[PDB]
């Protein structure tokens, strides 16, 4: 009855951005201002809809994607963006209808010696299409020389670590991100605000 947004936002561990997480929200009531009115989010930006009145609209589905990225990459989580994350890891469509929420997670996801658990895709042959996901681990080949599964001059494992350390500058600190996709179908509306 109450959308399980708490399990999305309050999860102990978040996914690497290349292996970003998705949860489908359906048949529930969403208390959106339990999220909008909180000063705990350094980013709360909505597209195609207003942050206001969010509790008065209804959608066929709501998808809650979440992942960890660098502080200065949060700007890439928006329609019309380019860069390592927008191009190679998580891509929003030009006509995105939803809200992007992010908060600093240095105290949870950083580690003395660098966190090795959070990764990103550094190389890709083509850009992701909106909401595409690539968890492949084939060695990336630059130039004409084949790699044959070994790194070298022109061959690099495509995933690399943020290595979050607590002393990093904020631009290089980890940020947890939640993307809410509001899906409007010609079908029964199943996710509804309280009013």
């Amino acid at each position, epitope marked *: 009855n109450l959308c399980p947004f708490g399990e999305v936002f309050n999860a102990t561990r978040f996914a690497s951005v290349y292996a970003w997480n998705r949860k489908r929200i359906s048949n529930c009531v969403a208390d959106y201002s339990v999220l909008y009115n909180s000063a705990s989010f350094s980013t709360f930006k909505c597209y195609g809809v207003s942050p206001t009145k969010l509790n008065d609209l209804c959608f066929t589905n709501v998808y809650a994607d979440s992942f960890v990225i660098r502080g200065d990459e949060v700007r890439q989580i928006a329609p019309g963006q380019t860069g*390592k994350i927008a191009d190679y890891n998580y891509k929003l469509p030009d006509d995105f209808t939803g809200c992007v929420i992010a908060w600093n997670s240095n105290n949870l996801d950083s580690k003395v010696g660098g966190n090795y658990n959070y990764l990103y895709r550094l190389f890709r042959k083509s850009n992701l299409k909106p909401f595409e996901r690539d968890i492949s681990t084939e060695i990336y080949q630059a130039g*004409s020389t084949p790699c044959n599964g070994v790194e070298g001059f022109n061959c690099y494992f495509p995933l690399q670590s943020y290595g979050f350390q607590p002393t990093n500058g904020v631009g290089y600190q980890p940020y947890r991100v939640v993307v809410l996709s509001f899906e409007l179908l010609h079908a029964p509306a199943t996710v509804c605000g309280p009013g």
Partner: antibody
Amino acid sequence: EVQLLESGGGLVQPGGSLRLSCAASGFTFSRFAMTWVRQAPGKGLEWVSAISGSGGSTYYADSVKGRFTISRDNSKNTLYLQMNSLRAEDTAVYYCAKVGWGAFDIWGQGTMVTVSS
Amino acid sequence: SVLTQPPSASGTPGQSVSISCSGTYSNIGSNPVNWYQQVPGTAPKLLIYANDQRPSGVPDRFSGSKSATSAFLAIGGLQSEDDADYYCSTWDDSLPGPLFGGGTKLTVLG
């Protein structure tokens, strides 16, 4: 900490041969590929040759394939470029560089090689 | 097989500038892009790798971008000490080693 110090540049006659060396320090030399890049006076940069961390694989640009031979001595942390059948077009400053994530992330100061009558 | 850069670029102190690098689908379109800064006489220095990534010690006013077949180096807050030749560089599916653009001389107008 990291440093690439090149040596051996000089004047050489057309058709002659010359060898350059690049001494490395401040990082585990054997774990990284290395490359040579050159720049003719007033011209842009041109990739010349590269070698695997172990030396088992070598790469050459067509402009030098057959005449130049790249090598390394991981026990002495040194990289070499043996140049043969030198022509006046090979005149340039020659740079040694470390390879990392598709780029050349650490360069040496360069050495001048003049092939002239 | 060739990467094309404008031979020159300029901007007034503190302003921004964007240096372009024009290629083809076989190089810029399919391979990571690097940018180098060379104060003439000194060795090139890596500014950008993998299209838009900065080595440690490179300030964030240097930023890289890429489109289908072209790459761009944006430089904010221009200082006179930014006067240098800037080189783009990428790989080509047909070649064993990377390519370099012809270079762009940046002048911070005085």
